[PDB]
Structures are given as C-alpha cells and as structure tokens.
C-alpha cells in the first residue's frame, strides 16, 4: 500500500486521484486516503502529490507511522473520490505547516 500522510490535511490537492488505475482512494473533509487493500502499489501517485504527503507504507516516516492505520480505518468509512477537484481555498496556506493531524476532520 501507499499512504496519505500529514501534509495533505487542509490541503487536499487531489491531483494524486487522476493517475490512480484502480481508484482507491476515499475522500473526507480535509483529507484524503488510500485504501490499502485495493491499491496495488503503482507508485503513481506519489510524484503527483504537490505536497509530497504520500509515501510507500515501508517508507513512512517515523513521526508518522500513525497514518498507516488510519488510512486503512477511514478507507473503510469515507466515499470514493476518482475525479480531481480544486485544492482546499487555503492550501498553500498549510502546505508544509506540520502536525496537521490535530486539525483532521471526520
Ligand atoms: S500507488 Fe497506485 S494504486 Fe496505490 S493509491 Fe497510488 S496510484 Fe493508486
Ligand atoms: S494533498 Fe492529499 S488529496 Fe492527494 S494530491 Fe496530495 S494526497
């Protein structure tokens, strides 16, 4: 699987869901993820996301190991997403703040 992780939130370019060949991601207020089942390990994502939030789960990073879990929970309760949309109204605003997670909406 690959993983969304912090700097997506309050970002949500959704740029990452144009290349995606199987459609697995799933979408929430302020944050999107993959589901880990479903996705096949393409990569193609990766070097979509403007804010460079999505990792190979075996490259995580340690302060964010949390988001391997929770990717996997909210891909089980929050809709598909399979078309890009504008990016959140004050991405560039967040882009890069950290701890992100504190402002998670479900
Ligand atoms: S690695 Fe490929 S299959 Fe998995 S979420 Fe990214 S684009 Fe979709
Ligand atoms: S910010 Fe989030 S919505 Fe996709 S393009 Fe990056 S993982």
Known sequence: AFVV???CI???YTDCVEVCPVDCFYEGPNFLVIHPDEC???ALCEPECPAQAIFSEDEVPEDMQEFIQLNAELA???PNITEKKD???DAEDWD???GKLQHLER
Do not use: A, M
């Open 96 to 98: 890069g703040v950290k």
């Open 76 to 78: 089980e309760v929050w």
């Open 87 to 89: 990016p959140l109204p």
């Open 40 to 42: 096949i390990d393409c």
């Open 10 to 12: 309050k970002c949500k």
């Open 5 to 7: 992780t912090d700097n």
